[PDB]
Structure formats: C-alpha cells, structure tokens
Symmetry: D2
Subunit: 384 residues, 4 copies
Amino acid sequence: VYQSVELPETHQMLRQTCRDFAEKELVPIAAQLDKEHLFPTSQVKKMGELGLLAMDVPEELSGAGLDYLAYSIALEEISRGCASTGVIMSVNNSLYLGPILKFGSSQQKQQWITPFTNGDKIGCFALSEPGNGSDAGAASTTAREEGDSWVLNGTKAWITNSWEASATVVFASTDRSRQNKGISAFLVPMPTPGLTLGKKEDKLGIRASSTANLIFEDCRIPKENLLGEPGMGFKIAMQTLDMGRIGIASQALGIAQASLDCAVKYAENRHAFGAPLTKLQNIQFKLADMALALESARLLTWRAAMLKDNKKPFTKESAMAKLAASEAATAISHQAIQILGGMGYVTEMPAERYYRDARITEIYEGTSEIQRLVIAGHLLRSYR
Amino acid sequence: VYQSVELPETHQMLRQTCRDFAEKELVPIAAQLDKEHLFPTSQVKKMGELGLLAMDVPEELSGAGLDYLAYSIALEEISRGCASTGVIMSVNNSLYLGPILKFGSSQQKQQWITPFTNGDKIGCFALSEPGNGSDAGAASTTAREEGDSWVLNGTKAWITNSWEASATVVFASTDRSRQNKGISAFLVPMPTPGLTLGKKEDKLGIRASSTANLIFEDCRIPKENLLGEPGMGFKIAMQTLDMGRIGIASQALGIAQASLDCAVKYAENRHAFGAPLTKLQNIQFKLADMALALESARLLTWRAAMLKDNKKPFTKESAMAKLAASEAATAISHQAIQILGGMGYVTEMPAERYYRDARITEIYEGTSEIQRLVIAGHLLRSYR
Amino acid sequence: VYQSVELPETHQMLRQTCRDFAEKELVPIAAQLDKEHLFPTSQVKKMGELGLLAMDVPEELSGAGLDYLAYSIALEEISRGCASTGVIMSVNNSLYLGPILKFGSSQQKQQWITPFTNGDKIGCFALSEPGNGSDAGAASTTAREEGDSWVLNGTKAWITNSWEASATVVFASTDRSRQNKGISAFLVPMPTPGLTLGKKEDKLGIRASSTANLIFEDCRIPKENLLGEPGMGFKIAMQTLDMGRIGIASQALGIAQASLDCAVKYAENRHAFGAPLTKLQNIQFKLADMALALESARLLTWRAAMLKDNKKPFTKESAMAKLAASEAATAISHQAIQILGGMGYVTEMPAERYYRDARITEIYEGTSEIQRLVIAGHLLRSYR
Amino acid sequence: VYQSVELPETHQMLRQTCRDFAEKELVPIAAQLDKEHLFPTSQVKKMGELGLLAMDVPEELSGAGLDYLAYSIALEEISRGCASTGVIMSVNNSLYLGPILKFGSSQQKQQWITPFTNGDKIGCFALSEPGNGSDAGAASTTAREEGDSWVLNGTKAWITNSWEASATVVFASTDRSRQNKGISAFLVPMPTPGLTLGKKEDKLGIRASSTANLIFEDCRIPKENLLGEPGMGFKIAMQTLDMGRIGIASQALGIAQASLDCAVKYAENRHAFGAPLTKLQNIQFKLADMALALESARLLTWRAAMLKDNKKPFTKESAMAKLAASEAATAISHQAIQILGGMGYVTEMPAERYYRDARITEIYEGTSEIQRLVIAGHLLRSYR
Ligand SMILES: CC(=O)CC(=O)SCCNC(=O)CCNC(=O)[C@H](O)C(C)(C)COP(=O)(O)OP(=O)(O)OC[C@H]1O[C@@H](n2cnc3c(N)ncnc32)[C@H](O)[C@@H]1OP(=O)(O)O
Ligand SMILES: CC(=O)CC(=O)SCCNC(=O)CCNC(=O)[C@H](O)C(C)(C)COP(=O)(O)OP(=O)(O)OC[C@H]1O[C@@H](n2cnc3c(N)ncnc32)[C@H](O)[C@@H]1OP(=O)(O)O
Ligand SMILES: CC(=O)CC(=O)SCCNC(=O)CCNC(=O)[C@H](O)C(C)(C)COP(=O)(O)OP(=O)(O)OC[C@H]1O[C@@H](n2cnc3c(N)ncnc32)[C@H](O)[C@@H]1OP(=O)(O)O
Ligand SMILES: CC(=O)CC(=O)SCCNC(=O)CCNC(=O)[C@H](O)C(C)(C)COP(=O)(O)OP(=O)(O)OC[C@H]1O[C@@H](n2cnc3c(N)ncnc32)[C@H](O)[C@@H]1OP(=O)(O)O
Ligand SMILES: Cc1cc2nc3c(=O)[nH]c(=O)nc-3n(C[C@H](O)[C@H](O)[C@H](O)COP(=O)(O)OP(=O)(O)OC[C@H]3O[C@@H](n4cnc5c(N)ncnc54)[C@H](O)[C@@H]3O)c2cc1C
Ligand SMILES: Cc1cc2nc3c(=O)[nH]c(=O)nc-3n(C[C@H](O)[C@H](O)[C@H](O)COP(=O)(O)OP(=O)(O)OC[C@H]3O[C@@H](n4cnc5c(N)ncnc54)[C@H](O)[C@@H]3O)c2cc1C
Ligand SMILES: Cc1cc2nc3c(=O)[nH]c(=O)nc-3n(C[C@H](O)[C@H](O)[C@H](O)COP(=O)(O)OP(=O)(O)OC[C@H]3O[C@@H](n4cnc5c(N)ncnc54)[C@H](O)[C@@H]3O)c2cc1C
Ligand SMILES: Cc1cc2nc3c(=O)[nH]c(=O)nc-3n(C[C@H](O)[C@H](O)[C@H](O)COP(=O)(O)OP(=O)(O)OC[C@H]3O[C@@H](n4cnc5c(N)ncnc54)[C@H](O)[C@@H]3O)c2cc1C
C-alpha cells in the first residue's frame, strides 16, 4: 500500500514471495505462537530453504547472495506476519552470521557460517549482561588464555534464540586494564561443557522467541575460536549492531504495517452513527498520520540498507531508521487498538498483540535514548 | 508524593487508610490476580466493610456518607495497588448505585442500594451492545410492557462485573423508531430467568475483572423495576457516565502514580556508566514530564469531583479529567517501561502490567475521541 | 550535512552552485529584505540567468531542461538563504509555468512561457478568494463569453507576486450550475484594463514577497486566453497544486536546514556551566530529533519529485512531503530559538525570522488539515 | 469562560474589574503598542491607581493588601488584553517589590517599596549577564566595599523595564572565586552616576516593553543599599524567581485565553464547504485540546499561588505552572493561527502577535529546560 520509485524486479519478486509465505505460513498461527510461547520450528526451516536466514551471505558459503535492501524488504513482510519469527530471522542474519562474515577467517566462515544457512541451525548474539546493557563496554564476563584455549567465566543476559541456538558470538573481557578497549569476541558452540542456559523469560511481547541468560563457568574453547584480534571486541559489536539495527527497523515496519492494515479494514466495515468509521473526519486524520509515519520510516530504513550495500558509512542512518521505525510502531499499533475500540482490547483481534510486540523495538539493540546519542554524535562530527 | 492545598482531615485521613490498605492487601497479590484472571473476592468484601463500595451513599441507606472528592482520592489509592480492583469498585459506586440514588424511588433505594453496600453483593452497568458502544442511542435491546411486567430481549456487550454481579441496570428501547428518545432504564436481578451470561472475555489488561455479554431472551421483570420515567433512559445513561468518568479518571491516576513510583525507585538503584540513572539529564527530564502530567490530571479530576459535590454542572470538567488522566497513564506507564529497560518488558516487574491496564482507560466509559467531542460541545456552548 | 545514496553528478553540481549563490547573494541581505519588505529584484534576475526560474521547462522553450528532483534540491538551497526568494521562485516554476506547459497549446507555450524564463518577467497563480481558500471549488469570480473574448468579474485573494508579475493564471466560474465542475483557467496579462491590485498585505513572515488581491471589474481578455477546455479548471488547479506542494516542501526543508545550522554552530560556541551546550545531554537529544525530522522530510520530498519525473501518480506523496516538511520547519525553527535562549528572541540573530517564515508553510497551497484529508482519501482508495 | 470551584467574592469581583479594564483600556491599543514598541505610560499609571502594581504589598506600605491568588487572576486578565503590559506589571510585583518585601529592613521597605506602588515609578530585576542566563551563579559583575559605599562594575543583560525604571535590584559578586556563594543583592536608584543604559533590544514579541543592558562603571551606592546579608544574593535571586515564575505562568495563561477566544469567535463565523468551521470534526478536536491545556495549566498556576499564600514550599509547583502554561500558550496560539488560516498570518488579526508574545514565556525567568531540572530535583527529593 506504498509507492516506491523504481525497485529492481528481483526485489519486487522477493517481496511478493515473502508476503505470500507470511500470509500462508505465519498469519494463521501467529496468535497460537504468542499464546503458547512456541518456537516456530517448521516455519523457520521452510524460511531457511527459501534462503531467508542467510540473505547477505554469498552463494559460495551457501548463502542467498542478495543484499541488505532485499533483507529489509523480506524482513518487513515476515514481521508483518509474526514479529517473533521476524526477530529470530534478524538475529541469525545480522547478529550471528554478520560479524563472522565480516571479521572471520576463511576457515571460521566455513565451519560457523555454512552450517547455519539452511534452517537446521541458528545462532545468537551475547553482549548484554545483568549489570549492563546500554553500557556495552562494561563487560564483566572474562576470558583467560590457557595456551591453546580460552576459559570463559561470567553471565550473559537476555539472549534471544538462546534455547534453540547451536552457536553464539560472545563478548568477554580479555584485558580489564583497558576497559572497553580490552574486550574480545569469541565463537562458542552450543551445547558445550561449562555453558548453562538460564530459565526462559516471561515477556510482554515476541513471546514465541526465547530469551534467557548464558552462564559460563570455566567454559573452555579452542584458542582459534577468537574472532578478529584481541581487544577488537567493542568495535565488532558496534559495527555488528549497525547492521542489526537496520533489521530491527525492518521488523518494526512490519508490525506497523499489520497494524495499519487491521485498522483500515475494520474502519471500513464498522458502522457508527449510520456510516463506516472512515466517514468520520477524525478517523481519516489518524490513518493519514499513521501512513505518513510508516512510509517515512521505510524510506529511512531503505536509505540505511542501501548505504550498507554501497559500502558507505551508515551508523547514523541506521540509528535514525531504527528509532523512527520503532517509535512509529508503538504509535501506529496504539491507534489501531483505539480505532477498533473495545475489539482492540481483546485477544480475538491481533491489535493488542501488535501493541505488545511493538514495545520491544524501542528497547533492544539499543534503546531510543541511545540511538539519539549516536545520532547527535555523528551529526556534530559532520559540523566540526 | 504531591503537595495539596489544604484537604479536610477526613479526606487526608482517608487517603492514609486507603494507601495502607492497598499496600497491605492489594500490592502483594496484584501480579497473581492479573496472571490468573482471579476476581479478588476477599478483598472486595474487606473494602465493602471499610465502606469503599458505597462512598457517596448516605448512612441512612448503609452508605459511608462521604462525597466524590473522597471517592476520587480513595479510588486513586486503591487503583495504585490493583487496577482491576479499582474498576470493580468504581462500577459499583458510580455506575450501579449512582443512578439508583439519583433517579430511584424511595422503595427502589431500599431494595437495590442497601443490599449492595457491604461487599456481599455488587452491581454492573449494561449500556453497550455488540453493534454499538460510542453510539449509545442505537440500542437494539428491547423492552415491552406486558401489563404488570416488562419483557426484555436483546444482547448487551462488554459488561464489567457481569460474572460476579447480583443486579444490573440495563438500557433498552421501548420504540426503536424513536431512536435515543425511546430508551428506558431497568433494574434486573442476577441471576434471573431469561438472562444468561456470555463467556468471559480474554483481554490485554484489568484481567482480574470479568467482561462478558448479557443475553436477554424474554426476560420478565416486575413493572416497578423501571428506573425513572419511560423514555428518560438516555438522559439517565448520560448523567450516570458523567459521574463514572470521574471514577475512571481516578483509576488512571492510580496506574500512573504506581508507574512513576516504580520508575523513580528503579532509576535511583540502577547504575549505568558509573552512576545512578537519575544522574542522566534525559532521565531527569522524563521524570519531570511524568510528574507534571500526573499532578496536572489530578487537579482536573479533583475539580470535577468538587463541582459534583457542590451540585454544579460538571460534564465538561468530568470529560477533561477522564481524557487527560487516561492519556497520562499510558504515556507515563510507557516511559516507566523505557526507564527500566529490559527489566520493563518482563513479568518479574510490574511495569508491563501497568502499561496493559492503562490502555483500557482511553477506551471505556467513552473513548478519548468521544471525550473530545463532549468537551468541544460544552466549550462552544459557553461562547454562544 | 546529510548523506544520500547515489545522486547524479548533475544534481550534486547543481546543489553546490545554488548553495554558493545563496551564500553569496542571499544570506547577507535576507535580514534587510525581511525588515524592509523589499522584493529582491536583482537577485531574481541573476537567478533567472542561472535558469532557476524555469527548471522543468525544456530547452526549446528557453527553459533549463532539468527535472523536479533538480528543482527540489535547488529550491532547498535557495530557501535556506531566503525563504521569500524561495517562494517567488517556486511560484514561477510550479504554479505559473507548470500548468501552461502541461495544458497549454503550442502557441500559448510560446507567448506565455518563453518570456518568463530569464528573470525579466515572473507570473502568479490566482485560485483563492476572500470567501474561500480551502474550499477551492467555491469560485465566485465569473467569466462570461462575449464572442471573441471573455469578461471577468470578481475578487481573487492572497496573490503572491501580484505586485511584480506580468501575467497570471486565474480560475473563474464559467458555469455555475455545475459548481466545482464549472470552473475554467485563464491566462491574463498584467497590467490590463479592468484589473486592479489590492493593497499589499502586512504579514508575519516571507515579508519580501508581495501578497495582495486581484480585483476584476469587467476585465476583458481574448477568447484564446482560455487554458485547456471549459470546465477543466478544477482539475488543472489540483494537478498544478500537486506540483507546487513539492516546491513548498522544498522551501520548508531549506528553512529547517538553516535553523539546524544556526542551532548547531551556536551550541558549540556558547558555554554554560563550564562547557559548550553540546555537552548537555538534553541539547544533544534535541539536535538528534531535529536532524531526524529534517532528513525524513527530505526523503519524502525527493520521492515525490522523482515520481513526478517518472510520470507516476504522486498526489499522495506530494501531500505527505509538504505536510511533513512544513511541520518539521516550525518544530525545528522553534527549537533553534530555544537553543539560542535570549539570543533567539532578538533580531540580531536569524532564528526568529526562520520561525516566522516557517509558519506559512503549514498554511498556503493547502493547510496541513487539507493535506491530511488528501492523504487519507488516497490511502483508503488503495485499500478498496 | 471556565468554571471554578468557589472563589471568595473579593477575587471573583477582582476578576471582573481587571477584565473590564483590559477590555476598555488595553485591547483597543494593543496592536499600536506592539507596532510602535510604545511603553503604555497612561495605562501603567491607571493600573497603579487600581493597586495592580503592588498587589501582595500590605496597605501600611501603600500596597493593595491582596495575595498571590488575586495577583495571578488579575495578571491573567491584564495579559489577555496586552502581553507587554502584563510583564511590566509582573516585574514590578514579583521581581522588584517581592525581594524588598521579603528581605528588606524596615527602612528599606519605606524607601524602596512605598514610592513604587502608585504607578509613578516602577522597578526592574538585574540578574542575567551577556555571558550567562541559565547559569545564574556565574555573574561577572562585581561589588567591592569602599567603607561607607559599595562600588559596582560590570554589565547586566536583558533587563526588562530598564528604560522606564527608577530603581533596580542588581546581583553582583563580592568574591568571584567563591562562585555562587559570593553573590550579594543591591538596590540601585536609576538614573545614577556610573550607570548607563544599553540601546533597546529589537525583539520578536512583547515589544511594548523595554529590554536592554545595564552598564556599571564604578557605580557607587550607599552601604545600606545591600539587600539581605553578604553572600545571601543567590538565595535571594532563587526565592524571588519562585514568585516571579507564578507571574509568568499567569501572563502565558492570558495570551493562551486571548488566543482561544479568537479561534472560537472566528470559527463560528467563517464558513467552509457550506457550514461554520465549528461543524468540522477536526476543528472541534483542536478547540477541545486547546481548552484542556489551558484550564489544566491554570489549575497548576492557582495551586502554586495558594501554596505561596499559605506559606508552604512552592518551588516545584511554581516551576510546573510556568512550564505547562508557557508551552500551552505557544501550542494554543499556534493553533489559533491555523484555524484562522490565511487571516492568521496577517497583522489585521491579533493571532500572529499572540504567537510572537507567547514564544518568550518559554524562555525568560528560566527556560523550559531549567524548569524541568528544578522539577526533577524536587521530585527526587520527595522520594529520598
Ligand atoms: C536481538 C537483540 O535484541 C540484540 C540485542 O539487543 S544486542 C545488545 C544491544 N546493546 C546496545 O546496542 C548497547 C548500546 N550502547 C552502544 O551502542 C554504545 O555502548 C554507546 C553508543 C553508548 C557508546 O559506548 P561508549 O562506551 O561511550 O564508547 P565510545 O566512546 O562511544 O566508543 C568507544 C570506541 O568504539 C568506537 N565505535 C563506536 N561506534 C562504532 C561503530 N559503529 N563502528 C566502529 N567503531 C565504533 C569509537 O569510535 C571508539 O573508538 P576509539 O575512541 O578507539 O577511536
Ligand atoms: C465499566 C465501564 O467501562 C463502563 C462503560 O464503559 S459504560 C458505556 C460507555 N459508553 C459511552 O460513554 C458512550 C459515549 N457516547 C456518549 O456519551 C454519547 O452517546 C454522545 C456524546 C456521543 C452523544 O450522543 P448523541 O446520540 O449524539 O446525543 P446528543 O444529541 O448529544 O444528545 C441527545 C440528548 O441527550 C442529552 N444529553 C447528552 N449528554 C447529557 C448529559 N451529560 N446530561 C444530560 N443530558 C445529556 C442532550 O441534551 C439531548 O437532549 P434532547 O435532544 O432530549 O434535548
Ligand atoms: C504560492 C501559494 O501560496 C499558492 C497558494 O497557496 S495556491 C491555493 C491553494 N489552495 C488549495 O490547495 C486548496 C485546498 N483544497 C483542495 O486541494 C481541494 O479543494 C480538496 C482536497 C479540499 C478537494 O475539494 P472538493 O471540492 O471536495 O473536490 P473532490 O470531490 O475531492 O474532487 C472533485 C474532482 O476533482 C478531482 N481531483 C482532485 N484532486 C485531483 C488531482 N490531484 N488531480 C486530478 N484530479 C483531481 C477529483 O477526482 C474529482 O473528479 P471527478 O469526481 O469528476 O472524477
Ligand atoms: C522579566 C524577566 O524575564 C526576568 C528574568 O528572566 S530573571 C532571570 C532568570 N534566570 C533564571 O531563572 C535562571 C535559571 N537558573 C536557575 O534557576 C538556577 O541557576 C539553577 C536551577 C540552574 C540552579 O543553579 P546552580 O548553580 O546549579 O545551584 P544549585 O546547586 O541548584 O543551588 C545552589 C544553592 O542555592 C540554593 N537554592 C536553589 N534554588 C533555591 C530556591 N528556590 N530557594 C532557596 N534556595 C535555593 C540551593 O539549595 C543551594 O544551597 P547551598 O548549596 O548553599 O546549600
Ligand atoms: C526481549 C529482549 C531481548 C533481548 N535480546 C538480546 C540479545 O539477543 N542479545 C543481547 O546481547 N542483548 C539482548 N537484550 C538486551 C538489550 O540489549 C538491553 O536490554 C538494552 O540494550 C537496554 O539495556 P538494559 O536493559 O541494561 O537497560 P539499562 O542500560 O539499564 O537502561 C535503562 C534506561 O536508562 C537509559 N540509559 C542508559 N544509558 C544511558 C545514557 N548514556 N544516556 C541516556 N540514557 C541512558 C536507557 O535508555 C533506558 O531507558 C534483550 C532485551 C529484551 C527485553
Ligand atoms: C474492558 C472493557 C470493559 C467494558 N465494560 C463496559 C461496561 O461495564 N458497560 C458498558 O455498557 N460498556 C462497557 N464497555 C464498552 C465500552 O463502553 C465501549 O467499548 C466504548 O464506548 C467504545 O465503543 P465500541 O467498542 O463499540 O467502539 P466503537 O464505538 O465502534 O468505536 C470505534 C472507534 O471509532 C471512534 N468513534 C465512534 N464514534 C465516533 C464519533 N462520533 N466521532 C469520533 N470518533 C468516533 C471511537 O472513538 C473509536 O476510536 C467495555 C469495554 C471494554 C474494552
Ligand atoms: C502569505 C500567503 C500567501 C498566499 N499566496 C497565495 C497565492 O499565491 N495564490 C492563491 O491562489 N492563494 C494564496 N494564498 C491563500 C491560501 O491558499 C489560503 O490562505 C489557504 O488555502 C487557506 O484558505 P483560507 O485562508 O481561506 O482558510 P480557510 O479555508 O477559511 O480555513 C480555515 C481553517 O479551517 C480548516 N479547514 C478548511 N476546510 C476544511 C476541511 N474540509 N476539513 C478540515 N479542516 C478544514 C483549515 O485547515 C484552516 O485551519 C496565500 C495565503 C497566505 C497566508
Ligand atoms: C525579552 C527578554 C527579557 C528578559 N528580561 C530579563 C530581566 O528583566 N532580568 C534578567 O535578569 N534577565 C532577563 N532575561 C534573560 C533570561 O533570564 C535569559 O535569557 C534566560 O534565562 C536564558 O539564558 P540565556 O539567554 O543566557 O541562555 P543560555 O543560558 O545560554 O541557554 C541556551 C540554551 O541552553 C539551555 N541550557 C542551559 N543550561 C542548561 C542546563 N543546565 N541544562 C539544560 N539545558 C540548559 C537553555 O535551556 C537554552 O535552551 C530576558 C530575556 C529576554 C529574551
């Protein structure tokens, strides 16, 4: 329901295919997945076969050989069907495969990427800890080197996919005297001796995805599991987040789109005072504001995705898309419930689920406050 | 807390009683009530014993003999402890006893008010129907006079307290062609022949309260169950809602206060980048805005209550309070989640429930759009 | 201070050239133009020589032979230097030349377009009247046919460029029984017998441009001055406004950009509490919100400009850009004054002028309320 | 109008007096005052005669003997007629007489208060300097005790009433190394040797009032001109501003009320699409929001006034009022222009002036950001 300039036929086809999939495989089960906190095993597998779980990964590594513009469009359509399935997909793409593909060695790419491109295995990203999330550099989890292996100790918090993943990219302190400059990234298989999973979190939204802590107690891994060079941890997490934030913005657009779709359809069929709700000036103004917010957020998101594809700096653009999209999702999903009235408050309709799923997009992968700090830093830098 | 002008000792003292009650009886069980959708039977009875279920009712009729200012203050403290308990209380006070006290005959007051003041029995308000909520005058439920009896037929929708009430005030048309001028109000005992309850509605918030349809199939009630004059029903519904809206304004103030308390307490303990969150300027600004919106909405609410007590017009003032408070509750509870970050998205903290409960205040007893219409109508009337 | 994907070198050069012009010719005199309500005669002429006054017009007609994407970029840079000069340019491009180029005959193009492409002569657009502006179809000005000429009678209101134009495209009723379907467009030379100019309006902003009524008293024009077919008036005004709204959105981006520029520069030099204002978290968040709003508005504007170039429908996109850009201009210019503090309230700085100039973008060429109606109409149509 | 709880006859009566005064003496000349930057000499004297320039001053000292509630009410009515006249009045009341009445010796009260209560003479408040406004404790102006005299040196900036005042309360440091603990307050007569006025500042709004720098070059004043104890100056400045902010809150309420009155009156007369603007739902919604924000801010203002009168702490409550009212004045005056459409952008109507005057209320006597800081500080103090 939005018009774009001249999108490549490859991307237009991709959009149609994902919309059909979401409409056929996700829409009818989204409610039950949310209610039962059930991981969409079968759906994720089918997605992998379509190559949706490794969109940016080249053909050589068994990837889809597409780009981030394609990734954003596909993620929106999927998230429109089920926000949980959308993040599960975003995590494997941007957060797991993303950093390995960019910083890993030929060998690491072959053993940690290839096995996670078809849906049989998915990864996760472990940066946050109980004592710190926004304050990323304050990593307390440590990694000691013991000759031909590293020994990890500490607790990681809020790990998405933790209960279904077969590997994780964890960030630990290897040199405390350098603080945020003494952090390193490590590839850890799951399960593995010394690694324990915390209890699943009971959350407001995206309840189909798992969220738990990762407890490391003298967990040993080979020395070669180090990703990049020692002390490169913070930079890797940051550049990885620049990519991931484009993914979360895309998930947000999908939730917002589903909300607008539901609101419009309901308003045209629901009568009040002898006519459809769409005859009320107020309802029109709302739908106008909702559409504007969404289409603006999509353009920002697409700009960021394209800058990444063209190999241009995109940290600020990524933060702007994530911020605008997430805030638009909550506002738009909020108005959808409003337009539905009483029907918007009950589980019979999906409006309340959209409201609950949207709320997380304003928090993870960097809260809105942090995105604003990031934007100001780059904005001022361009003025200096 | 907030600083008030100079409340009478009775009201200042009442505030303390209700806050201690909420703190001891509601706060510790609020999470369980929400999770189990459990009606707080023991607590409602206690509140009944305290005289909180019939505050504006004179002592002669077994009421507490207070006023709406006290009602507002008491309802805020209760709702801060549990939003469901608060609406259960507001319904009995404003929607059930209110209309009977104002338009009931001496005999109706003895029969229908007295047995509902101690917490053994409570009532409900049945105006809305599946096909109309905002458009209150389009009721399809009918009532025909069969000599010594009225016979009711139709379906009322969204009735709060429906599964626990012993009486209801229903609004039915006696001549559907006369539209909103053919509506009359009736008192119906529950249970009773010809009246069945719909299944409980599964909702986003205030889940400890029941919500369901009331189905009338040739339900016969004595001729004297007519409340007021025939065709006076719409007016009775409208004036009753003017009182009820001050009640919902008070409930919203409670959810908003509970939210602020949670945000402040957490903000002073949680550390980020070396210091408490309260040291961050942005955090300080959010708290300031949260405080302003809440104290501001409380003054509007108290104003409406006092006008009501002084027997002055208060329709516009009542709509302003309900509107400002309901929107503040959602904005403040939204920000409380943000300030807690990840912890605000999980059930371990109460913030997510506040967000859910707050959402309904912008919808029932007249949506925000309806409030705005009512406000605009009276405003214009003041200039002409 | 914004990053775009891959802009054609032709447009990048065009941007640089206009920025230099604005910086050299407009920035240093903008204040005096605003204070004295002085039309920038010399500047407009230089602009014409650069071909800025006929950007969309093909080379054959003595135009610049560019497109609307080029037009938007050039208009932003110019408006950043002086909002008045920007609208004077927008009017000649989109409102005067625009409709003649699209609906005029080969002959009309030669005598009404060619002489208005170099800066010696500029046109104006007369649709609004004292009794109606938003309600466009309610044209009261009439045109009677007298064989080989038309006779115009009535008053046109708020005509920009009226005191400096040499021609105007006026809309008059030729058939009152068909109302908004009985309006026709006419080309009228200025001066001409029967046409009188009203007194110049004293306005809040864009004071360098002239605004006055056009009084027609038995004003006769040749029959061939009719533009398009009889009754085609409304459609021509509407399609013309779709183009013009892209121009006003562009002017808005320029005012917003100048506001952001001023705010950033001032905040980095002004100290408070021992450090630049840019060290205060609050100021950072503001600048972040201002940049986001502006870059979002620019993308919307560019999308609309490009759809017009590609010959695709753009009415909704045009309305969205105009709305978002104008509202962003007022918010951003408002925060610029705020960040400057006392300095933002005095004429020594340009911040207050930006605030005053921005306010008009929310009104002319369709108020924000009307843009919202337009958007909803198309949004719903796409859902039908 | 608005419905109040139950004002004492004195205040209800005072409201009428001030409204009739504003209606007859200010409204008809407000446009000329703004346009000519003319200080309303005749009117200030009249207000002096009515006792409006020294409302909180006891009768023994020639004051009207009222309170801050009356002051607030009277100031709103005056500001509705002319925003400049209102600030001239607020300065004399809160910023000049306020500090002298609270910290002055018996003799200082007779010498500096009495001659300034009838409108023949008025005072000003000199705290800010070119290098600091928000950072009040960074004053560079110095005062050294030369035995029987103090000698002042420095520049105070932005002084309201500077060109018409006969006395000023200046804040100067006695030891710049002690920062905000080395500030003292002094009473300085005007004119006087060593004191020159800077040129009048040309500003966006409240143009009938004067604003200029005060330049001290070895200005000698008697030893007894010290207000309070040495080093007590910062505290005196802060407590004085707590009173002054209730004043600015009242002025903003006046500009906002004048704006609403203009919007309603115009909305009922202007026709569009067949009926009055008031028939359009969107117009009704704006008026409703405008009314809510204004009555809401008035209650906050009255609360602060009453606390002040009851000798209770009111710093936080005073900041909330000034903040909410100032922001409401800009939002409401902005919407008034929108509702008038084209007519709101020209000087023929007063809406554009309201917009201009409203803008300053968010800046002086402490910017909105400062108010928020003060609010957050006291809020947190209530929880600890
Ligand atoms: C599925 C999910 O739900 C996933 C999860 O959410 S993932 C976890 C999400 N967590 C976050 O996003 C955390 C938010 N925090 C951040 O992004 C950052 O910690 C921050 C913006 C607050 C900055 O942190 P900081 O400690 O102040 O570091 P700062 O001083 O800005 O930067 C330190 C270094 O990193 C570099 N850096 C920062 N961002 C960078 C980027 N995008 N690319 C490369 N380098 C970068 C800096 O340039 C600097 O390098 P030098 O000074 O050595 O040149
Ligand atoms: C626990 C819970 O959650 C409880 C539930 O929510 S309860 C159900 C809540 N539903 C609502 O609040 C519905 C919202 N709707 C309304 O308030 C109204 O339907 C409305 C404002 C939209 C107006 O409806 P309308 O059909 O246009 O009627 P309108 O023309 O305004 O009024 C009709 C008559 O009623 C009168 N009236 C309206 N409001 C009145 C009031 N507050 N007091 C007295 N009379 C009133 C009018 O003066 C008019 O009188 P006449 O024509 O006889 O002279
Ligand atoms: C420099 C300056 O400052 C310039 C000035 O501002 S210029 C003056 C600016 N004035 C405006 O922008 C006025 C705002 N008003 C409008 O745009 C319109 O009057 C409106 C949106 C309110 C709609 O008006 P309306 O009377 O309700 O007409 P509506 O029923 O929507 O449309 C009537 C016909 O015009 C057609 N139409 C509308 N927009 C159209 C467009 N963009 N292209 C083609 N046809 C269009 C409709 O399809 C319809 O045709 P049919 O029914 O015959 O198929
Ligand atoms: C007509 C007009 O237009 C008039 C003009 O505007 S008048 C000029 C307006 N300027 C302002 O309003 C300036 C805004 N700034 C302020 O209010 C303050 O400078 C501020 C809130 C930013 C705080 O400043 P600060 O330097 O950080 O001082 P802070 O640490 O808060 O306070 C220092 C001392 O003053 C005291 N103080 C602060 N506010 C106080 C109050 N309202 N009452 C009493 N004491 C107060 C503190 O308790 C503290 O005491 P000790 O340290 O001695 O125990
Ligand atoms: C459902 C869910 C899934 C998650 N999945 C993952 C995952 O897969 N992997 C992973 O690594 N992490 C994950 N997280 C963690 C997430 O990244 C953090 O929750 C988030 O970054 C915020 O950190 P926090 O919870 O510690 O909040 P805090 O950092 O404690 O922040 C609290 C508040 O203070 C504000 N704040 C903090 N610092 C500043 C500052 N400098 N300036 C201004 N304001 C500031 C924040 O904006 C927030 O409003 C997940 C969280 C959730 C809820
Ligand atoms: C938990 C819950 C409990 C409830 N309890 C009760 C109860 O005890 N008793 C009872 O009688 N009812 C009850 N209700 C019903 C409630 O009053 C209605 O849900 C509410 O009034 C809205 O009506 P609706 O749901 O039919 O929405 P609709 O009336 O269909 O409205 C949908 C949307 O259109 C808008 N709209 C409608 N008309 C207009 C208009 N003229 N102008 C502008 N916008 C308009 C609405 O504002 C809303 O945004 C309850 C509802 C809920 C969710
Ligand atoms: C500086 C300036 C320059 C101008 N230059 C030109 C020019 O060159 N050429 C030209 O032809 N015109 C010009 N105009 C006129 C301009 O297009 C109109 O002023 C504008 O369209 C609004 O019309 P109006 O002033 O009659 O306001 P009105 O139409 O009276 O509107 C008043 C209010 O009601 C609202 N409203 C109206 N209809 C509706 C509706 N259906 N639904 C909801 N809300 C509605 C409006 O949004 C507005 O808020 C200019 C105006 C100004 C101020
Ligand atoms: C018409 C007019 C009349 C005036 N009359 C008087 C008068 O009679 N007497 C008098 O003494 N003064 C007077 N002033 C001055 C007034 O008090 C200051 O303009 C105001 O306090 C802001 O100070 P500033 O202009 O130096 O701005 P700055 O202090 O430089 O501030 C600029 C921006 O930075 C922000 N900022 C600064 N510090 C902080 C912080 N800690 N946290 C967050 N944000 C911050 C401000 O909020 C503002 O947005 C007047 C000003 C005007 C415009």
